[PDB]
């Protein structure tokens, strides 16, 4: 056997990679946007004027699940 019954597993690392690298690469965006939210805000009492902007938190928890919905079907 050769054509693909062992040449697709070297591809399960090509799928179980992003899926696992993007999983984490996501959380960082959460930790980042949460951060930058405050950061920017702290600037309300330092600069002329801050920025009014809410963080679409939810959306992350959404794409957070589509994550483990594809982690349990491989």
């Amino acid at each position: 056997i050769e054509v693909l019954k062992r040449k697709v597993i070297e591809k399960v690392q090509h799928i179980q990679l992003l899926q696992k690298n993007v999983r984490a690469q996501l959380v960082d965006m959460k930790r980042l946007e949460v951060d930058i939210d405050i950061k920017i805000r702290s600037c309300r009492g330092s600069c002329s004027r801050a920025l009014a902007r809410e963080v679409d938190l939810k959306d992350y928890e959404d794409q957070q699940k589509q994550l483990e919905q594809v982690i349990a079907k491989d």
Binding site: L18, Q25, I38, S46, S48
Partner: protein, 307 residues
């Protein structure tokens, strides 16, 4: 033998995700780079205030309300003649005035995750101008310099009071008839007692949810002051990344961390999670003994008086 139908339906789907995502983030990051390159734009100009000073003045807020100052605004005190008068906010309404603010949190307006010196000299906005008026009757977010706080207590028998308000609107208190903070030379060692109150004696007894050894490492009484560059928490280790102050993002009397962490991070809404914290710790304006490690207040303030 038959895992050949996946490359047809299973993966062309176990892949569509990554697209619907890595496409989103790649996009939802520009928004950020954008917000920032903007705020940076705004900042070319600082915020301004004009706090004309009230005639009356004393050694501290008390003497003052005693000398006739009856409105809650910004006054100018001079506790010790050895040092020049500094500005401070006086609370002359809550609990019979005379209250000298040491720490106050009410919005995100000020970064509290600062270095040692800053905490030693103090920082923040003492007070802003009341809508219209020419005096700053509104307090701001600040931390009167450590040295000043120290000296304020080492004057005489000082009592401490801590208030906080959740986002829904309810309140609580934390009286400490006795309160002191040694000088810098003594790592501004805290010390309190006589807990009257409704928030739960965090500073002295520790979290109300941690048992035995786990709670005693939440008590602040007798603890030293820590900042993200000057360790002094009850956490003893070789690992440098482990310092309550680096985590819990602030400067405060840390003892293998806390039970109550004002000066924490100001999370909007109050409801916050670990997968949200820069360090996964319960950093944020928290008073465990009343809302648990996962809830940053909407308002938190430490004010003193002699008694």
């Amino acid at each position: 033998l038959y895992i050949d139908e996946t490359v047809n339906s299973n993966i062309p789907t176990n892949l569509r995700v990554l697209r619907s995502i890595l496409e989103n983030l790649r996009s939802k990051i520009q928004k950020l780079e954008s917000d920032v390159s903007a705020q940076m734009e705004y900042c070319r100009t600082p915020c301004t205030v004009s706090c004309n000073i009230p005639v009356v003045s004393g050694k501290e807020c008390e003497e003052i309300i005693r000398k006739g100052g009856e409105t809650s605004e910004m006054y100018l005190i001079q506790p010790d003649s050895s040092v020049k008068p500094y500005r401070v906010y006086c609370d002359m309404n809550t609990e019979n005035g005379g209250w000298t603010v040491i720490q106050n949190r009410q919005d995100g307006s000020v970064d509290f995750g600062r270095k040692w010196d800053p905490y030693k000299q103090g920082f923040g906005n003492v007070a802003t101008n009341t809508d219209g008026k020419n005096y700053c009757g509104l307090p701001g977010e600040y931390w009167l310099g450590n040295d000043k706080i120290s000296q304020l207590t080492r004057m005489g028998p000082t009592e401490l009071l801590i208030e906080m308000e959740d986002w829904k609107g309810d309140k609580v208190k934390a009286h400490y008839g006795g309160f002191t903070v040694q000088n810098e030379a003594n790592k501004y060692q805290i010390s309190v007692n006589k807990y009257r109150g409704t928030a739960g004696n965090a500073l002295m007894d520790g979290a109300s949810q941690l048992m035995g050894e786990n709670r005693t490492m939440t008590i602040h009484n007798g603890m030293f002051f820590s900042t993200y560059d000057r360790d002094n928490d009850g956490w003893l280790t070789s690992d440098p990344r482990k310092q309550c102050s680096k985590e819990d993002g602030g400067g405060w009397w840390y003892n293998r961390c806390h039970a109550a962490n004002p000066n924490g991070r100001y999370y909007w809404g109050g409801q916050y999670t670990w997968d949200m914290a820069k360090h996964g710790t319960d950093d944020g304006v928290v008073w465990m003994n009343w809302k648990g490690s996962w809830y940053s207040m909407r308002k938190m303030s430490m004010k003193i008086r002699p008694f």
